């Protein structure tokens, strides 16, 4: 298939493996999650514009909006973590081992 | 020797110690979100490259 | 559980965006309108096992 | 399994052809067991709230019995309907495909050789 | 929380799951999962302590990752099929990604690592919602895509879930983690029979929801979250020890109880398909689940652990908690096996 | 009971149970054939409804 | 069989609506009435079993076990009402309800026409027995004994579940009456080898097989007296009943699958009997003797000759009555000295002469004194195993030495010698206790007058 | 009745016995139809067993 | 890793010993790499060197189990002249169990791994013989 889809899928996998390998910050995790969403937006958009499927042109906007609301919720969770420990470090979130 | 030790050793005590040991391996996690998602990425890589669950 | 509420009540919640060959605004066809119409009219009703 | 059968008429608890079937009796032992489950629910409801178990709230116990018999009657109707649909589809498929279901020639034991295994 | 806001948020959780159940477009499937997650996050942060925020953060990260993999599976389906019907998928890569995403949502092993944490971090009512209501929407999507699910993947996930949920509960004393590893094992049992007979998948889901709702309702009615506080129940309410006894013996699947009903039916559908090793090893692995159930019954019903003196004060007060449907759920989770051919209503 | 009663009651039992066993064997064979061929009413997994297709004259003719 | 199921279920409102001083008398009376009614099952024929319905049937194998089961409930109520006298009233009713529920599960375990219903009842009998052991047992090790009793049984029985569902899918049915006529020969393959193991190992655990018997000298010992009575007298015999039902389907592979297990019993009954020579615990001695007696039943079912099945079912009924009486004698001394150590209370014939006469009679039935049905079952098994292989008489006859040598040692250590000086709470024999001993021993002696009712479907 | 508890188990026998007789009429497909026991009915006889 | 098991099972029993040994060694090495990957995933090693030491130790342990398993299986199938026989895999599985006990430096783990892994390898041989399916295809 087309050549641009290779790069958009590879971008989704790069943002996947960034989201699946945390370093320290939860904000960097949320950025990798939104990179995954952005690559999904681009890939859906290039397909729907290519196929001239008219009714799905409203589809990526929807894919934006919900997920950005999702991002808002994630930011709020991070802030609550930051209001407990002072930092958004993922190693502070280890109390549920016992 | 037999009906207090060895017939007691081979079927119930070895199985009970094995399930105890596997239970202590599974639940010895450090609560780190980093390690669980790193295991998820290793899972996806083993599933695609090593187990071929996408073919 | 596919509780088919849309066919039960006769409402159309999401069938319109489902396929490319559906009713489009300003009668804009998809680039693969004819192929998708032929595949759907082939595979209609006979089930997925026979449709493959 | 039968999900393509109940897909042209979806979300119908009892279809119209279910009215061709004999409904379960009110003295159905399955329905009497469901009424016994209602009575047990009434006794457990008195026990968990520390009421006298057999005496307190007979109206509540009777509504437990009535509600379980009421729901279980329709559940038994749908049960009998789904097994009727199962057998109807089976027999129509055996009738429409004779080449897959031939009549096996049944041989009497005068021809049928069985190997004797002596127990000694 | 404002009770009106609690009602609207629980109706939004239910609305998300119902939108997953009734929709014919994959975008509305993804929307129902997003609405479900977005609305269930305040249910987990109901008490506002750092364990609830940690649990909600872990829950958000796992469900968000699964939602992104779900949308990538949907988008690859749109690549290779040009449409959006919620039916079989038209690519084994999209099928693998959707099966992984739904395994992450259900918390099936090896994506199980959030389930005993999050259930520990949240209250008993929100844990009840997470272990009963949050299974319904991904099992509906798995119900509708089973002509495309890889057999080796779904059975690998099933046996890995059953074994890890068996060994995980043996080391626990916290009741919520016990119910979470019980969840992982039972989801393994549900997905092991999915490609063979999905009516038995629905049967196992319904009997599991009934038994889990009974055990969480007993834990809420007795206000016990640990084994050793559950062992004070005989000196406070002796009927509840009988109820946790019969319900835990049901959840292990001992006949003549109704929790023997699903797994037996599952074996009844796995030997028709010439699989004998797999349901036998599954049934032998479920003895571990029954072992820590028996541990809880020995702590609670069949012995009497020592109590404290202040228990004598609680003798003067009856339970004012609304024990909603507890006799009904207790009767249904124990005495339903003579009505086993009722399962045809799920066909 | 009489030996006649036990005898013929046994014969009724054997008829009912042998009929049920033959029906279970036919049920297994029917399930195997319908899953393999997809031509019966069972295992009818859904496809797209062709009543969703617009057949109107579109904006461009080559379709 | 519904004329026995419904009275057994009506024992539940009979015990939950009785007055607080009346729950032993009413249950004892009406369970004796059910046991009197149990004799109608002796309408047996030389060719046809008594086939009640699609669900229940009773041949001459299930019938003596049914009579023994329905007779054992009043005797358990008499044995268990003393040590539960200070028990709470509702827990007393829960104990009686578990015994009633166990009788209910057993009487439709033995009459189950279809084998998966046999399996459901057969494994339903675990739960009241488990609850009785772990709730009304006396010591700390009742919990571990309940775990062993549960988890040897389920590890045996879940492959039986898989194998019975396989027979259901292959033969089309699990009706035993259908499978008498549709049974296909089982050839030599590894698939049929594990078919045989899955069909047999559950009953091997429940008999118990030697090497798998480890649950029993805990579960029979840590239980209360009604638990030990129902475990020894009935619940071991579910294994032999299920073997005699299931080895119809396992021919001719059984003729070379039986060889290890036959060894495991023919040596194992030498071992456990030898173990009874050095048991300091009297109740454990009776437990190991139960293993020793059921090993002969295992051999007799595996060699599958008519004399062997007749001796096996005679020995099952005889051992039910004998081991139940032996546990009741051990409890009658435990209720006095409060220790199960056999060397503690000695010389009891000087103090309790009639109870020592009961000890003598139960010892003589334990060592298979003719013409008791213990000797009838013992002897027919020895005849059939001699016809199997002539050398086995050595392992039979040596067994019959050691079986005497622990039976009279149990008689000599407890009843004979000088009485213990520092023990002074040795009350005279209560009328309930002697009634219990007679209600065990007198049917066991009257069955020698007409033993043909306890000789199975092929007498 | 002052001793109504002593009829729970006996009537539970009789009722159970009744159901067994009621069961036998549902298993009468081969009544007087077996090859071993079939015969002609006597006068003032409508069934060969009940 | 489906092709690894194919190139194991394509060779007949007791015919080509070193290629069978290399195929079973590769299967053991793949299993050791999977166990090592989850081991350094869920339990963080204190260094890169300790992590690669754990990885090399587990990979060589399971590779030695597979090597001595396939070697002992093929040598027994050669010297007993019976290729279709599960006693050969019982011997090979006990040799692999003794290999696991030698790597764990203990006798009782070696005897337990002998018994259980030998019975498991015998079951795998019987499943190849009679066609037992663990992931059986949905047919009804
Ligand atoms: C063919 C290739 C493909 C096959 C399939 C994949 C291969 C793997 C086999 C199947 C999976 C087994 C488990 C893998 C992970 C290991 C567990 C682990 O994390 O351990 C670390 C860690 C152990 O550390 P610990 O707790 O600190 O204790 C260790 C002590 O300190 C000190 O302990 P120590 O120093 O003694 O060493 C510890 C370690 C050392 O263990 C070893 O070195 C043993 C390695 C295997 C030996 C046997 C090899 C035999 C090879 C076959 C024979 C060859 C010929 C075959 C011919 C044909 C057949 C006859 O042992 C353990 O960890 C024991 C528990 C795990 C047992 C693994 C069993 C492997 C079976 C292999 C069958 C083949 O345990 C955990 O973290 C437990 C939690 C893990 C939960 C998640 C697990 C998920 C696993 C998923 C795998 C499959 C992916 C599915 C994808 C598709 C669905 C999405
Ligand atoms: C019937 C079965 C279900 C009964 C549930 C309620 C039982 C209850 O509350 O009993 C107390 C009540 C007497 O209590 P109370 O003096 O009023 O006040 C409570 C006490 O103070 C109690 O004193 P407390 O609570 O202060 O302390 C003592 C403590 C003593 O407890 C302890 O110390 C802890 C436990 C000790 C160890 C465990 C022993 C065994 C207990 C559990 C059972 C396990 C086995 C069950 C089956 C195996 C599977 C697990 O607790 C109790 O005794 C609590 C009472 C409950 C005892 C019985 C439990 C039954 C429920 C579980 C079994 C049935 C359902 C599952 C069946 C599964 C499949 C077969 O008993 C009865 O009245 C029994 C019923 C007798 C009349 C029956 C009439 C039948 C009429 C039929 C015709 C009308 C209906 C028509 C229907 C059809 C229409 C179409
Ligand atoms: C169809 C599926 C039905 C699913 C269940 C629906 C109800 C439960 C969900 C909502 C809920 O929790 O409601 C409370 C719930 C009682 O649960 P609870 O608070 O745990 O019970 C404690 C006491 O009942 C508390 O007693 P109380 O002192 O507060 O007042 C006595 C109360 C007063 O009742 C009323 O006031 C009711 C009349 C007004 C209703 C509204 C009119 C507007 O009586 C009752 O509620 C008696 C309980 C009746 C049984 C409840 C379960 C019904 C059967 C569920 C399905 C069973 C299927 C078995 C099949 C087995 C074989 C597969 O239901 C009611 O209060 C009304 C029950 C009406 C049943 C109608 C059944 C046929 C419907 C067509
Ligand atoms: C699996 C085979 C065994 C390998 C694992 C052994 C246990 C873990 C271990 O090494 O712990 C030590 C070590 C640390 O524990 P530890 O502190 O030494 O604890 C032991 C004490 O030192 C105590 O001192 P010790 O080391 O001397 O005593 C340990 C004792 C050694 O026992 C003795 O020394 C006395 C008894 C002799 C050995 C047992 C004989 C059993 C014979 C079979 C039963 C009777 C069959 C009769 C058949 C008749 C007809 C032929 O061994 C066990 O307890 C293991 C029993 C067998 C485990 C598997 C049971 C599965 C049952 C499944 C249902 C059936 O564990 C670790 O570092 C974790 C990782 C270990 C290496 C990875 C695990 C091997 C995975 C290989 C692949 C297996 C695939 C699955 C095959 C089986 C299922 C199909
Ligand atoms: C209590 C039960 C109350 C039921 C009220 C009526 C609900 C209803 O109409 O449900 C429709 C549904 C049958 O619809 P159908 O399209 O066959 O479902 C396919 C599912 N895979 O009916 C059913 O699915 C009935 C069985 C539902 C049982 C759920 C609780 C157990
Ligand atoms: C410890 C407590 C007490 C014990 C409790 C009971 C536990 C053990 C239960 C099983 C006992 C062993 C199985 C029964 C043996 C009966 C005869 C048999 O199968 O002999 C072994 C077999 C003989 O060879 P052959 O007959 O040629 O086999 C080809 C079949 N087509 O020999 C061979 O082929 C060689 C060996 C192959 C491996 C067999 C492994 C499976 C059986 C054991 C499990
Ligand atoms: C053989 C080669 C294996 C190479 C991978 C394992 C090496 C390892 O364990 O590295 C340690 C590393 C943790 O890095 P570390 O330096 O300890 O972090 C603290 C900050 N200095 O650990 C990690 O980064 C954990 C993840 C490493 C990759 C795991 C999957 C690949 C290796 C196994 C399959 C091959
Ligand atoms: C207790 C647990 C007991 C488990 C018993 C398992 C019995 C063996 C089942 C798997 C097996 O070996 O099947 C044989 C099969 C080769 O036969 P076939 O179907 O022709 O495969 C070629 C496909 N074109 O082989 C295959 O399908 C592939 C090879 C399977 C090997 C299984 C063991 C691998 C190593 C351990 C994991």
Curated annotation (Swiss-Prot), chain A:
Query: What GO terms in the biological process aspect are recorded for it?
Result: ATP synthesis coupled electron transport
Enzyme Commission numbers on file: 7.1.1.2
Q: Its quaternary structure?
A: Core subunit of respiratory chain NADH dehydrogenase (Complex I) which is composed of 45 different subunits.
According to its UniProt record, which protein family does this protein belong to? Belongs to the complex I subunit 4L family.
Provide the transmembrane region boundaries: 1-21, 29-49, 61-81
Q: Which residues form a coiled coil?
A: none
A single GO cellular-component term on record: mitochondrial inner membrane
Name of this protein: NADH-ubiquinone oxidoreductase chain 4L
Please name the Pfam families in this protein's record: Oxidored_q2
One MF annotation (Gene Ontology) recorded for this entry: NADH dehydrogenase (ubiquinone) activity
Q: Which reaction does it catalyse?
A: a ubiquinone + NADH + 5 H(+)(in) = a ubiquinol + NAD(+) + 4 H(+)(out)
Which organism is this protein's natural source? Ovis aries
Where does this protein reside within or beyond the cell? Answer: Mitochondrion inner membrane
Does the keyword Nucleotide-binding belong to this entry? no
Supply the alphabetized keyword list: Electron transport, Membrane, Mitochondrion, Mitochondrion inner membrane, NAD, Respiratory chain, Translocase, Transmembrane, Transmembrane helix, Transport, Ubiquinone
Mode of membrane association: Multi-pass membrane protein
Task: Say yes or no: keyword Nucleotide-binding present.
Answer: no
Q: Summarize the protein's role.
A: Core subunit of the mitochondrial membrane respiratory chain NADH dehydrogenase (Complex I) which catalyzes electron transfer from NADH through the respiratory chain, using ubiquinone as an electron acceptor. Part of the enzyme membrane arm which is embedded in the lipid bilayer and involved in proton translocation.
Swiss-Prot record, chain B:
Oligomeric state and interaction partners are given as: Core subunit of respiratory chain NADH dehydrogenase (Complex I) which is composed of 45 different subunits.
Q: Which organism does this record belong to?
A: Ovis aries (Sheep)
- What the protein does? Core subunit of the mitochondrial membrane respiratory chain NADH dehydrogenase (Complex I) which catalyzes electron transfer from NADH through the respiratory chain, using ubiquinone as an electron acceptor. Essential for the catalytic activity and assembly of complex I.
Q: Where in the cell is it found?
A: Mitochondrion inner membrane
Residues annotated as transmembrane: 31-51
Highest taxon above the source species = Eukaryota
Under what name is this protein listed? NADH-ubiquinone oxidoreductase chain 5
Q: Give the similarity note.
A: Belongs to the complex I subunit 5 family.
Curated annotation (Swiss-Prot), chain E:
Which organism is this entry from?
Ovis aries (Sheep)
Tell me its family: Belongs to the complex I subunit 2 family.
- Membrane topology, as annotated: Multi-pass membrane protein
Q: Name one GO cellular component term.
A: mitochondrial inner membrane
EC number, UniProt record:
7.1.1.2
Keyword 4Fe-4S in annotation: no
Question: Which key words are in the record?
Answer: Electron transport, Membrane, Mitochondrion, Mitochondrion inner membrane, NAD, Respiratory chain, Translocase, Transmembrane, Transmembrane helix, Transport, Ubiquinone
Free-text function comment from the UniProt entry: Core subunit of the mitochondrial membrane respiratory chain NADH dehydrogenase (Complex I) which catalyzes electron transfer from NADH through the respiratory chain, using ubiquinone as an electron acceptor. Essential for the catalytic activity and assembly of complex I.
Database matches in InterPro entries: Complex_I_Subunit_2, NADH_DH_su2_C, NADH_UbQ_OxRdtase_chain2, ND/Mrp_TM
Enzyme class label: translocase
State if Iron-sulfur is listed as a keyword.
no
User: Gene of origin?
Assistant: MT-ND2
Membrane-spanning segments:
3-23, 25-45, 67-87, 96-116, 122-142, 145-165, 178-198, 200-220, 237-257, 274-294, 325-345
GO MF term list: NADH dehydrogenase (ubiquinone) activity
The subcellular location is: Mitochondrion inner membrane
Please report the name of this protein according to its UniProt entry. NADH-ubiquinone oxidoreductase chain 2
Q: Which GO terms describe its biological process?
A: mitochondrial electron transport, NADH to ubiquinone; mitochondrial respiratory chain complex I assembly; reactive oxygen species metabolic process
Q: What does it catalyze? A: a ubiquinone + NADH + 5 H(+)(in) = a ubiquinol + NAD(+) + 4 H(+)(out)
From Swiss-Prot, chain G:
Q: Which GO terms describe its molecular function?
A: NADH dehydrogenase (ubiquinone) activity; ubiquinone binding
Principal EC category: translocase
This protein's GO CC annotations: mitochondrial inner membrane; respiratory chain complex I
Where is the protein localized? Mitochondrion inner membrane
Pfam families referenced in this protein's UniProt entry, alphabetically: Oxidored_q5_N, Proton_antipo_M
Question: Which controlled-vocabulary keywords does the entry list?
Answer: Electron transport, Membrane, Mitochondrion, Mitochondrion inner membrane, NAD, Respiratory chain, Translocase, Transmembrane, Transmembrane helix, Transport, Ubiquinone
**According to the UniProt entry, what is the EC number of this protein?**
7.1.1.2
Q: Which residue ranges does UniProt annotate as crossing the membrane?
A: 22-42, 60-80, 98-118, 147-167, 196-216, 224-244, 256-276, 284-303, 308-330, 351-371, 391-411
Q: Where does it mainly reside?
A: mitochondrion
InterPro entries, per this entry?
A: NADH4_N, NADH_Q_OxRdtase_chainM/4, NADH_UbQ_OxRdtase, ND/Mrp_TM
GO terms for biological process, alphabetical:
electron transport coupled proton transport; mitochondrial electron transport, NADH to ubiquinone; mitochondrial respiratory chain complex I assembly
Membrane topology for this entry?
Answer: Multi-pass membrane protein
The reaction(s) catalysed by this protein are: a ubiquinone + NADH + 5 H(+)(in) = a ubiquinol + NAD(+) + 4 H(+)(out)
Q: Which family is this sequence assigned to? A: Belongs to the complex I subunit 4 family.
Q: What does this protein do?
A: Core subunit of the mitochondrial membrane respiratory chain NADH dehydrogenase (Complex I) which catalyzes electron transfer from NADH through the respiratory chain, using ubiquinone as an electron acceptor. Essential for the catalytic activity and assembly of complex I.
**Summary of subunit composition and partner proteins:** Core subunit of respiratory chain NADH dehydrogenase (Complex I) which is composed of 45 different subunits.
- Protein's recorded name: NADH-ubiquinone oxidoreductase chain 4
Q: Which organism is it from?
A: Ovis aries
